[PDB]
Design a protein around this nucleic acid. Structure first.
Lengths: 135, 87, 199, 80
RNA sequence: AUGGAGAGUUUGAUCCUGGCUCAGGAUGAACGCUGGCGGCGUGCCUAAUACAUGCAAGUCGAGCGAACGGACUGAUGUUAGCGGCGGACGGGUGAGUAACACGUGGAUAACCUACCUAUAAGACUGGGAUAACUUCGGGAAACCGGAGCUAAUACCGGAUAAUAUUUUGACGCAUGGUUCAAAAGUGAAAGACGGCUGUCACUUAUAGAUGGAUCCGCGCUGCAUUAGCUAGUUGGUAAGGUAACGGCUUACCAAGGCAACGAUGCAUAGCCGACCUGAGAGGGUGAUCGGCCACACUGGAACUGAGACACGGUCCAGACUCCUACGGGAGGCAGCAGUAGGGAAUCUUCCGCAAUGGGCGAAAGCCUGACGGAGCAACGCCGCGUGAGUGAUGAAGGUCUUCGGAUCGUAAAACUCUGUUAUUAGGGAAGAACAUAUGUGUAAGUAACUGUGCACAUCUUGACGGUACCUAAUCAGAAAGCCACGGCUAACUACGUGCCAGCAGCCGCGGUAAUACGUAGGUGGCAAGCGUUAUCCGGAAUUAUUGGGCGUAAAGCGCGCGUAGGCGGUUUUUUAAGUCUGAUGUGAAAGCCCACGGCUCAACCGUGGAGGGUCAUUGGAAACUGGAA
């Protein structure tokens, strides 16, 4: 562009879509419209608990759950680790981060924190998974 | 009115003071009109006063009045005496 | 101490003595552990640039952040940058209580300064990283001059550098003049550190 | 103390006692450093209305004097 | 000079283009697992949601009366009241606000200011009332209604009095100015002293200091799939009234003003010093601290005052909450603690006015949820530790094995040594400097004195806090975990499982011989922390001013005529807007940076510089760009 062209119309940059977009919203219950927060975790309550099958080459039966959050948006969230204990109407803390195989799953359920428990016999990165130190 | 007073600096348990021409309505630590001096009640032998002695006489001559321990300070300088004198 | 681990295994892995020399790397002069005795492969750029941070820092017992928080004071001065780093660490206080011979090892000349025996300039100082400077006076406390490990350490020392004096009776140093690179630990390529911290 | 003055050019005359000047100025442009030219119409006040449309004149500033006028005519300088 | 690194991932292989991902620094963070100590900080970012309970503003009997109450006439009170002053400060919060809000440079011959300080002139003479009090009544509170009284530095009538308003004469536009000489009007206080005067109340005139108000220049969010906006609107003319200019109004008139340099609309937002990131250019942000602004259940308003249209004032309208003998009464934490709700998420219903500051009072004193401390929380920074020395890199154990061995490993026993801390057992700082009183001088004023101001040296007292801190004694005891180990990117093996269970930032791994899954040895990185997630900047030259392109990878409009706008041959003279060089005034402090001092070091604190502007004013130069001839 010549310098007159960049003075009439100037250069504009591009915008950042997030990942994780349902963590950037909160709900004002009384005025009754959404609000913006940028929180790192949100609390939810689970409305299903099942398993999906992965994609292109992979293969397994992968445990996941549908959970509606504090603002009232609903999402699927992968349950990590090996065992679990979720039912209907459990209270989970959810966190960012997508699982690549599953289409359309893009949150993770923090193990350790609310109703969810740590994993049952883990010893080596035990603070993901949160389990406590044996003996 | 317009006063001549001390602000407080330093950190906890360890104060330093600047000697200030403010206004009486102001908060201790905010808006001022001039700075005049310095004072350090805690250092070793006696406190270190230090105070420009010809701005302070400008302001005693205009009104300001000193608070009660800036009257023990402009005293050791005999500033409160050359002010007395020019009758 | 802070590290207070095991100094022969760190001496075999990096390749310098780190002590009274030689003795560490004798029978087994290779790295430690199960794949120990079997051929070393090659180290990368990062591989090698990091072996020099870690050489100069396990010598002087510092940790990171204290090591790195010093690295750029050193690089505030005028001069060449990566030799004031070498100098300013020579001038630490447990590092001067070692170059004088007041103790026989570096982990012990820090429990002197720490436990409160040393008294630079007449006043007790117990901060291993105090940063003494040209003209000060390292001495010894007075109820602590017939500690065994002090008289035993001072005889056999045999050496004192040239920016230090040492009045071997009285137990009393000086720290005369700053050092210069010709005298500081010598298996240490100092631009393998300045280029590590510009990554 | 003294009160700022300008030089101008009259771009209207329809009001009564009241002419509108255009003063021309210039700003560089903080990012690509070329200058630009712009303008801004100062409403000024003349009494026994003299100056005419299109006409380099000169104006000084004063106390507020109607809703929008704040300057007054000083001296014509030339016309056609 | 002090400053600038990349790597993986499209092919059978290659060179490009182009996305994607990682490695760095940040944060009022949260979350998971672990946690020894000290110092400096920080800590509801969400519903400006609702608030239970205690406190955040009082003070003066040297203005005054009291049925006052009472030492002893009643000291002292002020239980109560009238009067005076402060309550507009300080404390909180950003809902609203795209605005002269804010920042920066100017003007106001268009302005206001209690007190403080000076300099003069004064304070004259009278009056009428009234609180409290008392006595009758009512009213569920809340309170009210009569009388009968009584003070005040309360209120008022005149006396006199400027530069007060008028009418005369002797520049920056509407002028300003001071010399008049007439006229109209306009003041006041006593209190507590000493022998008439000192103190501190009043009143008027001027100034100064201080705190405001107004106007302008310039900067300062996006959105045309938002192109027309206004009607006191835009000028004029009078009249009001404002502290002050003005459509600021009200009439009477005219038909204007504004806008693609973006009128209007719409969405969003306090602003700034500053902060974070980047070699920089730039980008992101406006916690804690200061300056400004706005707001106090919500919307209207006025009183009192120098100053408010008023967080702990008033009245009205609305919604809420409580009480009641149903007629009516009361309220309002975006003060400080604290409660409920909501959220991933955020502290004691804490002590003292000791210091520093304010309010009132002659002072003593009093009031202060300002402030000073102390509690809570690894929430951050910074320092010290959890030993050190020698000692077989062999015991016996784990793990591997090529079964010989190898490794953990100087690691451990083992002997010594020390006390940071830890414990007990004794001492024990500064932060303070007074005010006030008491003397003694001195100076002014005095008939003289009291007093006043100054100078001195005396007397007092620290919440924290017996908190630092010191000195002994005692003992290595009581103080490390968390994440890796395929490649990027330091650190590998064994076994279990067998596209299962799982893992995954990206590439991808797992289908009975995975350094990728789990666990166990060994390694490596960091450390009272270490991982994970959210967000910002860099890498990214991936908006390119630095510093990019359009034949074929994304990209020259099918082509003309042309309007703004941008840009333009040669020479001379002049001008000086841009340009260059000075001098000043400013761009607060705190920052940032540099120097230095004080902290045992360091964080931290304190001083002096330096830097920082499309800045203003005033001089000079004249090549270039511009203006003229």
């Amino acid at each position: 562009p010549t310098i007159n062209q960049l003075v009439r119309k100037p250069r504009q940059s591009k915008i950042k879509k997030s990942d994780s977009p349902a963590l950037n919203k909160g709900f004002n219950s009384k005025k009754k419209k959404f609000t913006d927060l940028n929180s790192p975790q949100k609390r939810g309550v689970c409305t299903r608990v099942g398993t999906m099958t992965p994609k292109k080459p992979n293969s397994a039966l992968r445990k996941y759950a549908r959970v509606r959050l504090s603002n009232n948006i609903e999402i699927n969230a992968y349950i990590p680790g090996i065992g679990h204990n979720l039912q209907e109407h459990s209270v989970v803390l959810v966190r960012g981060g997508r699982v690549k195989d599953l289409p359309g799953v893009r949150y993770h359920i923090v193990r350790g924190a609310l109703d969810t428990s740590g994993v049952d016999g883990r010893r080596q990165g035990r603070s993901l998974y949160g389990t406590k130190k044996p003996k | 009115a317009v006063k001549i007073r001390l602000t407080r600096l330093g950190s906890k348990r360890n104060p330093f003071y600047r000697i200030v021409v403010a206004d009486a309505r102001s908060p201790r630590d905010g808006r001022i009109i001039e700075q005049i001096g310095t004072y350090n009640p805690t250092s070793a032998n006696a406190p270190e006063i230090k105070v420009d002695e010809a701005l302070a006489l400008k302001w005693l001559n205009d009104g300001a009045k000193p608070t009660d321990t800036v009257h023990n300070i402009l005293s050791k300088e005999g500033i409160m005496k050359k002010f007395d004198e020019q009758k | 101490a802070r590290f207070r681990g095991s100094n022969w295994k760190k001496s075999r892995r990096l390749g310098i003595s780190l002590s009274g020399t030689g003795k560490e790397l004798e029978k087994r002069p290779y790295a430690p552990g199960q794949h120990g005795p079997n051929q070393r492969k090659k180290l990368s750029e990062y591989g090698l640039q990091l072996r020099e941070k870690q050489k100069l820092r396990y010598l002087y017992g510092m940790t990171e952040r204290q090591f790195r928080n010093t690295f750029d004071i050193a690089g505030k001065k005028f001069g060449v940058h990566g030799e004031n780093f070498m100098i300013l660490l020579a001038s630490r206080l447990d590092a001067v209580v070692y170059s004088l011979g007041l103790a026989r090892t570096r982990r012990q000349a820090r429990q002197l300064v720490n436990h409160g025996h040393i008294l630079v300039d007449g006043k007790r100082v117990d901060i291993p990283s105090y940063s003494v400077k040209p003209g000060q006076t390292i001495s010894v406390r007075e109820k602590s001059q017939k500690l065994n490990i002090i008289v035993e350490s001072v005889e056999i020392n045999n050496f004192v550098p040239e920016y230090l004096n040492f009045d071997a009776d009285s137990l009393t140093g000086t720290f005369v003049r700053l050092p210069e690179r010709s005298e500081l630990p010598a298996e240490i390529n100092e631009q393998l550190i300045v280029e590590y911290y510009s990554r | 103390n003294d009160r700022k003055v300008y030089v101008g050019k009259v771009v209207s005359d329809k009001m009564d006692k009241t002419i509108t000047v255009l003063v021309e100025t210039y700003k560089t442009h903080k990012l690509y450093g070329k200058r630009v030219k712009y303008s801004k119409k100062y409403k000024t006040h003349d009494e026994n209305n003299s100056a005419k449309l299109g006409d380099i004149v000169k104006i000084q500033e004063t106390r507020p004097l109607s809703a929008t006028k704040r300057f007054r005519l000083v001296e014509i300088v030339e016309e056609s």
